[PDB]
Amino acid sequence: MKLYYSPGACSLSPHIALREAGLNFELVQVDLASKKTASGQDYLEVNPAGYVPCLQLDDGRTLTEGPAIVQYVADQVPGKQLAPANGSFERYHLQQWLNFISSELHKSFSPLFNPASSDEWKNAVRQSLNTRLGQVARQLEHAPYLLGDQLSVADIYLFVVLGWSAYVNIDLSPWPSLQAFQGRVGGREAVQSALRAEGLIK
Amino acid sequence: MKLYYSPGACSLSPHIALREAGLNFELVQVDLASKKTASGQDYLEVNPAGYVPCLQLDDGRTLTEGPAIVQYVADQVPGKQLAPANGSFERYHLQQWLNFISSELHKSFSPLFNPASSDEWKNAVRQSLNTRLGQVARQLEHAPYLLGDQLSVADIYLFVVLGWSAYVNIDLSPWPSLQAFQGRVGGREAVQSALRAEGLI
Numbered sequence: 001m002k003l004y005y006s007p008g009a010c011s012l013s014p015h016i017a018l019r020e021a022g023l024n025f026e027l028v029q030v031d032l033a034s035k036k037t038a039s040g041q042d043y044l045e046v047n048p049a050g051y052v053p054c055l056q057l058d059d060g061r062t063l064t065e066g067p068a069i070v071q072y073v074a075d076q077v078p079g080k081q082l083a084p085a086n087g088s089f090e091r092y093h094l095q096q097w098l099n100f101i102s103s104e105l106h107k108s109f110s111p112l113f114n115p116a117s118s119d120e121w122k123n124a125v126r127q128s129l130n131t132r133l134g135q136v137a138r139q140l141e142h143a144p145y146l147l148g149d150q151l152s153v154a155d156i157y158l159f160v161v162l163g164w165s166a167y168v169n170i171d172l173s174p175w176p177s178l179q180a181f182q183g184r185v186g187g188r189e190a191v192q193s194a195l196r197a198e199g200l201i202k
Numbered sequence: 203m204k205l206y207y208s209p210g211a212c213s214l215s216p217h218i219a220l221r222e223a224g225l226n227f228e229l230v231q232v233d234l235a236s237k238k239t240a241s242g243q244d245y246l247e248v249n250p251a252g253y254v255p256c257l258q259l260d261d262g263r264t265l266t267e268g269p270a271i272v273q274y275v276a277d278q279v280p281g282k283q284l285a286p287a288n289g290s291f292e293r294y295h296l297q298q299w300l301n302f303i304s305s306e307l308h309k310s311f312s313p314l315f316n317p318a319s320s321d322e323w324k325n326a327v328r329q330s331l332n333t334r335l336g337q338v339a340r341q342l343e344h345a346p347y348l349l350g351d352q353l354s355v356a357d358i359y360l361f362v363v364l365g366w367s368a369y370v371n372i373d374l375s376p377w378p379s380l381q382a383f384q385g386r387v388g389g390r391e392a393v394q395s396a397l398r399a400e401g402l403i
């Protein structure tokens with residue numbers, strides 16, 4: 001199982017999930033600049049959309065889109081409840097959160113990270129991110145995790161997006177519950193191993 | 203169940219999936235302006251996010267995000283195969299497409315619908331669509347649906363999304379495979395029923 005990734009990108013979510021699940025995997029760095037995998041092969045042959053993450057099973061099948069990959073990873077180790085059982089209400093609830101993070105949070109940072117982005121665009125999204133983040137913050141005051149007391153891949157995904165905040169000057173102090181969450185998820189060794197592994201910390 | 207929708211919006215996807223699954227439901231329009239259901243109720247009480255769709259089970263429980271809602275709907279009548287079986291690779295492959303349409307297509311269209319967005323904003327996102335729409339078009343070139351021969355909820359979501367390409371002047375003639383897809387999904391009774399019901403006459 002190979003994970004095409006880039007240090008610090010959204011691919012850190014499935015990365016952490018892989019460590020949390022304890023599967024067999026290999027991190028394959030993709031040059032987002034040149035679009036070549038570690039082997040210097042054209043990544044677009046793997047993901048024509050050109051982005052990461054991308055999971056590649058040893059048999060050759062690939063899977064893209066963070067939310068899809070982390071659910072596949074989770075379903076490999078049901079014992080470690082990183083996703084409610086399929087068919088159960090909480091599974092659709094997990095899928096609800098995963099999409100929310102993807103559509104309503106992740107994509108709202110993308111314009112910030114891009115220089116070409118006009119301020120009259122980078123601001124139109126910061127406002128939104130403020131609104132969305134407040135919603136998440138309130139969800140995290142109730143219980144420790146998104147789905148309650150049980151951690152899921154949604155939390156890992158969210159944890160990752162919350163990490164870019166600092167890079168784009170987004171303050172999370174307004175929401176203490178978000179900070180308590182970050183310290184709570186970042187406190188897991190799988191999480192620390194991934195940060196260390198991506199050269200993000202240490 | 204109740205489906206909080208708005209005519210033509212992306213709530214049209216779960217609406218079609220509902221009819222396709224042969225599941226009966228009640229439509230509850232939501233004034234995306236006032237954020238009040240058709241009963242005056244404050245929609246932000248239902249969805250703090252303020253957007254449709256929102257599926258409310260008979261339980262009284264609720265669900266948001268198109269991709270989740272349509273997967274719940276699909277799994278209710280597996281006999282209709284609106285989604286590959288859970289635990290099957292193609293099910294994750296389906297979710298791959300649902301997240302793609304949501305973040306790589308649906309949210310690209312959002313800006314093109316807002317007037318309070320810089321003129322340069324729409325330009326950038328218009329190329330993204332051309333890039334992504336090109337990949338989807340290529341997907342449906344040698345196969346009728348996103349996952350092959352069997353129509354899934356992913357195709358329904360895509361159908362609704364492309365339907366907006368008119369209101370935003372995104373000619374699809376460059377992508378005949380998309381015009382075919384559109385003409386294909388659009389001819390389904392469940393589709394035309396949802397249109398008629400949403401008053402899209």
Ligand SMILES: N[C@@H](CCC(=O)N[C@@H](CS)C(=O)NCC(=O)O)C(=O)O
Binds near residue numbers: 053064065066067301
């Ligand atoms: N919809 C995709 C988005 C993936 C994505 O945006 N990946 C970024 C990294 S965070 C990327 O590699 N973009 C291509 C690039 O920057 O060249 C998903 O949820 O997985």
Ligand SMILES: N[C@@H](CCC(=O)N[C@@H](CS)C(=O)NCC(=O)O)C(=O)O
Binds near residue numbers: 208209212312313
């Ligand atoms: N009813 C429209 C299509 C529906 C539509 O306009 N959807 C809009 C908002 S209701 C949309 O693309 N929303 C994307 C977004 O807000 O992100 C038509 O077919 O003429």
Ligand SMILES: N[C@@H](CCC(=O)N[C@@H](CS)C(=O)NCC(=O)O)C(=O)O
Binds near residue numbers: 103104252304
């Ligand atoms: N992330 C949501 C997107 C839903 C969405 O953007 N809905 C639009 C219409 S298609 C909306 O209701 N926007 C709020 C408004 O128009 O007031 C999902 O995947 O379901």
